[PDB]
Amino acid sequence: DMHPSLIKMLRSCKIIAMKVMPDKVMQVMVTVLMHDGVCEEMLLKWNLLDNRGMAIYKVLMEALCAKKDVKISTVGKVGPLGCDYINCVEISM
Amino acid sequence: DMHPSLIKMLRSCKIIAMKVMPDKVMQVMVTVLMHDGVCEEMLLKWNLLDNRGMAIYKVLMEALCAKKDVKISTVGKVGPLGCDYINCVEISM
Amino acid sequence: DMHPSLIKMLRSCKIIAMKVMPDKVMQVMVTVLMHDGVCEEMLLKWNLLDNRGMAIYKVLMEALCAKKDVKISTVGKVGPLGCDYINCVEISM
Amino acid sequence: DMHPSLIKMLRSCKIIAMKVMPDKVMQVMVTVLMHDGVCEEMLLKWNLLDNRGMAIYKVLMEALCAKKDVKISTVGKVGPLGCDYINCVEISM
């Protein structure tokens, strides 16, 4: 039982770029920098046309614009476009 | 009749974490710190797939990223996942 | 023909509170402070369930959280809940 | 192969105004200032009622409120309202 104000699969990272391209197969590509120095290009598990994709898209965007560390998890397989898929994001004050 | 610029169920709190997990039963879990020191885990009254859930999700997120105090009210019962449900948020400049 | 970086119905104002209450008849009530000192409570022209209401809801929220002056116009009649309805918002860098 | 934290059709610009007007033919007009000093008024490729239009609308808005440079591409033709249409936005931390 920790301090009320202290928080506490999920890797810590920074969201360093997002390219929104709803004309194309990727739809939106997220560039992520992990805490151990590796940089990875990733997609969202859901279509942007689905509200679940919109919700994941928004927390990632806010994390980039606030310059925040976040934690993410992915489905765990590279797809036919060459990227893993983000399916969970955690953000804290 | 108060100063034009002065504002004025609803408890004052801070939104200290949000975990967006649209694969799972909770969908999104909000960690809230009340002004009297108690910390509580909460859900939204509406599905994320519904625009009302999206609207509550956005004001909470903005409150976390701006480091703002807000006021919330809940439906008033713990559900089968162990959490109350947020149904109203008020935010001020 | 003005400087490329210089911008330029619409009244200038600040968005000083927003109360998101999708359980109730108002859905979301916006408290607005006009530049001449009068303060007014206002609704949105569109349902929150409609994407046009969502779009107006988002620019207002961003204006509150960034502490920005904006310009708004309304439909021009008080409705049966006692408020006018915002139908246009302009925001500038 | 560049530094992990270093990023890298698309023109660099600032988003200096947005006018959200879902009553009218334009729906939302974006004023953009390119790096070479020319200023241009632009629309979105998608309807605001479509989630793809909402996604492009949000990254533009965040870019304005964070005072960020971004890159955009357009469809490449002036339409019957006198404007080109934005179809891709890239934003970086």
Q: What is the DSSP string of C9-76?
A: --EEEEEEEEEEETTSTTEEEEEEEETTS-EEEEEESS-TTSHHHHHHHHHHHHHHHTT-EEEEEE-S
Integer Cα distance of B66 and C71 in angstroms: 22
- What tokens appear for D15 in the block? 């988003």
Using the beta-carbon criterion (under 8 Å), do B17 and A7 form an inter-chain contact?
yes
For chain C, the residues before each gap (C–N > 2.5 Å) are 8
What burial class does residue C92 get, using C-beta atoms within 10 Å of its C-beta: 0-12 exposed, 13-18 middle, 19+ buried?
Answer: middle
- Residue D42 has φ and ψ, to the nearest 5°, of -140, 155
- What tokens appear for A7 in the block? 């928080």
Between β-strands A84-92 and A39-44, what pairing exists: parallel, antiparallel or unpaired?
parallel
Side chain identity at residue D79, one-letter code: G
Integer Cα distance of A85 and A37 in angstroms: 20
Residue B83, SS3 per DSSP: coil
Question: Which experimental method was this entry solved with?
Answer: X-ray
Residue B42, SS3 per DSSP: strand
Q: Tokens 């994320």 map to which residue?
A: B48
Side chain identity at residue B82, one-letter code: G
Using only C-alpha atoms, chain B has a radius of gyration, in whole angstroms, of: 14
Integer Cα distance of D71 and D59 in angstroms: 11
Nearest one of D45, D21, D17, D47 to D31, comparing CA atoms: D17
Tell me how close the Cα of B25 comes to any Cα of chain A, in angstroms.
Answer: 13
- Tell me if D74 sits within 8 A of D42, measured CB to CB: yes
Nearest one of D15, A93, C8 to B30, comparing CA atoms: A93
Tell me how close the Cα of B43 comes to any Cα of chain A, in angstroms.
Answer: 14
Side chain identity at residue A26, one-letter code: M
Side chain identity at residue D33, one-letter code: L
Whether A and C touch (3+ CB pairs < 8 Å), yes or no: no
- Residue A52 has φ and ψ, to the nearest 5°, of -70, -40
Sequence-separated (6 or more) residues with CB below 8 Å from residue A83: A26, A29, A41, A42, A43
Integer Cα distance of A65 and A80 in angstroms: 29
How many CB contacts within 8 angstroms connect chain A with chain D? 72
Q: How many CB atoms lie within 10 A of CB A42?
A: 19
- What is the sign of the dihedral through the CA atoms of A3, B25, B9 and C85? positive
Integer Cα distance of B65 and B55 in angstroms: 16
Q: Tokens 């975990």 map to which residue?
A: B19
Nearest one of C54, B83, A61 to D22, comparing CA atoms: C54
For chain B, the residues before each gap (C–N > 2.5 Å) are 8
Integer Cα distance of C87 and C43 in angstroms: 9
Integer Cα distance of B14 and C63 in angstroms: 20
DSSP state of B37: S
DSSP state of D76: S
What is the DSSP track for A3-63? -TTS----EEEEEEEEEEETTSTTEEEEEEEETTS-EEEEEESS-TTSHHHHHHHHHHHHH
Residues in chain A whose Cβ is within 8 Å of chain D:
14-23, 28, 31, 33, 37-39, 48-51, 54, 57-58, 61-62, 64-65, 67
Sequence-separated (6 or more) residues with CB below 8 Å from residue D60: D15, D18, D30, D70, D86, D89
DSSP H or E segment with residue B55: helix B51-65
Q: Tokens 């202290």 map to which residue?
A: A6
Where do the domains of chain A lie, and which CATH numbers do they carry? 11-90 (2.40.50)
- What tokens appear for C71 in the block? 């310009």
Residues in chain B whose Cβ is within 8 Å of chain A:
14-23, 28, 31, 33, 37-39, 48-51, 54, 57-58, 61-62, 64-65, 67
- Residue C37 has φ and ψ, to the nearest 5°, of 95, -10
**Which residues from B are below 8 Å from C23, CB to CB?**
45, 87-88
Tell me how close the Cα of A1 comes to any Cα of chain D, in angstroms.
Answer: 35
Helix, strand, coil percentages in chain B from 3-state DSSP, rounded to 5: 15, 45, 40
Integer Cα distance of D58 and D75 in angstroms: 19
DSSP H or E segment with residue A78: none
